[PDB]
Each structure stands twice: as C-alpha cells, then as structure tokens.
C-alpha cells in the first residue's frame, strides 16, 4: 500500500473515521501501524471492485483494527453499535450483570472469553427523533388519540427492536424523555393556550378504553 500511495508526513491519520459515541479509551487508538494496516486493507478491497459497476468510498466505510495496541474491536451492524472486549485484554475486573453487556463465551470449553457492549446507532436515534418531529408537525388539526397512537407505535417499534441497547445508551433515555415531554406539551397547548403548572398525569396515562389517552411511558414519572 505504501509503495502505491507513499505517505511521507504520516498524513494517514487525518481522515480516519472513528466511533465518537464510545469513550476515548474504548474507541480505536490511531497508532501508526494500525492506521496503515486499516488503510491498506481498505485499498486492497477497493482495488478488486471495478469502479464502473460499484464503488466503496472511504468516508462512508469504517475499518477497525484489533492488535497489540488496540484492545477493542468495534463495528456497526443493523443499527446496533457493538464493541467486543476480550477478557484477557484490558479487563482485569469482575463483572456483574448489566443490561447491554452480552457475555460471549467459548462454545467448546464454555468459558467467558469476551464481552460485547451494545449501544444504539446515532443514525437510529436521529431517525427516531425525526419521526417524533414529523408526528408533532403533522399533528395539525388531528386528534389527541391519533397523536398518542402514533407515539405509541413509534416507541413500541424502537423499544422492541433495540431492547438492551436502549438501556445501555444514556443519550437515548434523555432523548426519549425529551420527546415524551414534547408530546405532552403539544397536548396541553391544544388544551389551552397557557401552559399549566403540575399537570396531572392520569389524563395521559389512563387506558384508552377507560376514557384516557393510554399513553405509553419510558421515563420516571412519579404520581
């Protein structure tokens, strides 16, 4: 790779895509050797595909290297954000049961060898936020029941797809509560032009068949 595309300034670190969502010591560590290896692997793969049929851009791709310097292996798949950490490598610690941590264990000797930490893709979080924004704008003259039905369907889909990742992602919980508050405020503004103080939650959370809106909750609401 370096004979093909010589790099005298070690410029190979400028454009290296990284997973910002993880902490600094969990992200990839842009060491010289690992950076060069990742770029070389991407170059080798790109060479095989003719550019008349299809392309493989670097900006939209991501190549993660696990080696003597990097102890984590990262990848994004199907909207999840997975980071695999070996037990032998930079763990040195006992582990209790957290929601978002899968305990990957060897299949023949049945021994805990690695842990996979899950998070929700920033793209998926933005998609959910935009869906909520669409609900709010398109509400217009629509009914409170229909608004709450849309919110319920969106929340159910998100929470049944990203089951543990939602609990593991701290940003997603804050986003969820902010969006739920937005929906509640929309209903209240529809009720009256002046926002109230200490609005009762029974109206929102009473089941539909019992006269209420049957709103689903994913926050800490104290009655």
């Amino acid at each position: 790779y370096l004979t093909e595309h010589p790099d005298p300034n070690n410029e190979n670190i400028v454009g290296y895509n990284n997973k910002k969502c993880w902490p600094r010591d969990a992200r990839m560590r842009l060491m010289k050797h690992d950076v060069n290896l990742g770029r070389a692997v991407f170059w080798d793969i790109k060479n095989r595909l003719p550019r008349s049929v299809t392309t493989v851009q670097w900006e939209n791709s991501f190549v993660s290297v696990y080696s003597k310097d990097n102890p984590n292996l990262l990848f994004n798949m199907c909207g999840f954000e997975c980071r695999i950490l070996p037990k032998c490598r930079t763990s040195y610690e006992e582990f209790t049961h957290k929601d978002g941590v899968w305990n990957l264990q060897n299949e023949v000797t049945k021994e805990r060898t690695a842990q996979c930490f899950l998070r929700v893709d920033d793209e998926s979080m933005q998609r959910f936020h935009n869906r909520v924004r669409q609900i709010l704008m398109a509400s217009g003259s629509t009914t409170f029941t229909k608004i709450v039905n849309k919110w319920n369907t969106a929340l159910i889909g998100l929470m049944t797809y990203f089951r543990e990742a939602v609990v593991n992602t701290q940003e997603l919980l804050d986003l969820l509560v902010k969006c739920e508050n937005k929906i509640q405020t929309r209903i209240k503004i529809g009720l009256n032009s002046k926002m109230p103080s200490r609005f009762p939650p029974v109206v929102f959370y009473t089941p539909k068949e019992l006269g209420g809106l049957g709103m689903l909750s994913m926050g800490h609401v104290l009655i």
Binding site: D174, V177, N181, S197, R198, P200, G219, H220, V221
Partner: peptide
Amino acid sequence: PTGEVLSLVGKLEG
C-alpha cells in the same frame, strides 16, 4: 411533584 417525566438515567439500579 410536577407531572413532568424524568430521565431514567441513574434510576435503573434495582
């Protein structure tokens, strides 16, 4: 005790 909904963060211990 306002009717606002609060983030679960830090309230999943139990």
